[PDB]
Amino acid sequence: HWGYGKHNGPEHWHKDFPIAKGERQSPVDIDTHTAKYDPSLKPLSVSYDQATSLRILNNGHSFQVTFDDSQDKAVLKGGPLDGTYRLLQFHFHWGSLDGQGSEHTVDKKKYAAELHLVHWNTKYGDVGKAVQQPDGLAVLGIFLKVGSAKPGLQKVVDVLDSIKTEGKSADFTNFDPRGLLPESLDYWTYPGSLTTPPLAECVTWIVLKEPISVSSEQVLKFRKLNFNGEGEPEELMVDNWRPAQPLKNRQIKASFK
Numbered sequence: 001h002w003g004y005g006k007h008n009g010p011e012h013w014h015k016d017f018p019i020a021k022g023e024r025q026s027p028v029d030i031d032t033h034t035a036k037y038d039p040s041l042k043p044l045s046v047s048y049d050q051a052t053s054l055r056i057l058n059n060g061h062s063f064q065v066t067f068d069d070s071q072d073k074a075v076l077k078g079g080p081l082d083g084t085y086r087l088l089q090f091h092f093h094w095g096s097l098d099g100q101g102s103e104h105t106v107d108k109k110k111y112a113a114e115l116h117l118v119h120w121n122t123k124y125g126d127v128g129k130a131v132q133q134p135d136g137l138a139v140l141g142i143f144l145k146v147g148s149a150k151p152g153l154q155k156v157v158d159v160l161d162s163i164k165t166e167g168k169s170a171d172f173t174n175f176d177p178r179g180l181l182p183e184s185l186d187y188w189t190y191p192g193s194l195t196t197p198p199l200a201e202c203v204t205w206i207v208l209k210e211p212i213s214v215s216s217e218q219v220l221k222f223r224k225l226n227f228n229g230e231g232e233p234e235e236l237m238v239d240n241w242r243p244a245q246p247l248k249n250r251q252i253k254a255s256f257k
C-alpha cells in the first residue's frame with residue numbers, strides 16, 4: 001500500500017495510479033514573477049460561520065478534522081469558482097524539520113507545513129462523484145511558518161495524543177476553522193489534482209499568499225504522530241508531502257498586483 005517512504009512513496013505512486021504522470025498534477029512550484037495578475041478574478045468568499053466539526057482522525061497519511069457536509073453550512077464560493085463548494089475536511093502536510101513540509105513551493109521556498117481545506121462542488125451531489133469531474137473539488141491551501149503560536153490551532157494540537165496511530169479517531173465538535181486563516185485572502189490559482197492517491201485531476205487549487213505562523217511546540221506535536229498502527233514498529237508521521245510536479249501547459253493566476 002502507498003505511503004511516503006523509500007519503497008512506497010511519491011516516486012512509486014504512478015504504478016498503481018498512472019495519472020501521476022498526467023497533464024495537470026499537483027502540487028507545483030509557484031513562480032511569483034511568472035504568475036499573471038488577473039483583474040477578472042473575484043474575491044474569495046469563505047463562509048464558515050455555521051461550520052459543524054464532527055471528528056478528528058489519524059488515517060496513516062495525515063490527520064484530518066471532518067465536517068458535516070450534508071447541508072451548505074461551511075462553503076467556499078467566488079474567486080475562480082463557479083457555484084458552491086461544501087467543506088468536507090481539513091488536514092496538514094509537514095516535515096521532519098522546519099525547512100521542508102509544504103507541498104506547494106513559492107520561488108522554490110518550502111514552508112514547514114501546509115494546511116488543506118477540502119471542498120466539493122454541490123452540483124455533483126457527493127464527493128465520490130465530484131472527484132470524477134475536472135471542476136469537482138476546490139482545495140484552499142495555507143502555508144505554515146514557525147514563529148509565534150497560532151491560538152486557533154491549539155485545540156487541534158491538544159488532542160493529537162489521543163489519535164497517535166493509524167485508525168484512531170476522537171470526538172471533535174465545536175471547532176471553528178476561521179481561527180486557522182491569515183488576514184489576507186490574496187491568492188494564486190491553477191487547475192490541478194489531488195496530491196495523494198488517487199491523484200485525480202479534479203481540483204481547482206486556491207493557494208493563499210500570506211502564511212500563518214505556528215509555534216515550534218505546535219509543530220513538534222504533529223511530529224509525534226505515527227504512520228503505523230498500534231503494535232507495529234514505530235515510524236514517525238513526518239515528511240508526508242508530495243514534491244512539486246511539472247507545470248506543463250498551465251498558467252498560474254494571481255488575484256493581486
Ligand SMILES: [N]S(=O)(=O)[C][C][C][C+2]123B4[B@@]15[B@]16B7[B@]89B1[C+]651B5[B@]8([B@@]512)B7493
Pocket residue numbers: 116118127131139193194195196197198
Ligand atoms: N492533499 S489533498 O489533495 O487535499 C487530498 C486529501 C485526501 C482526500 B482522499 B480524502 B478522499 B480522496 B479526495 B476524497 C477525501 B477527498 B480528498 B479527501 B482525496
Ligand SMILES: [Zn+2]
Pocket residue numbers: 091092093116195
Ligand atoms: Zn493535502
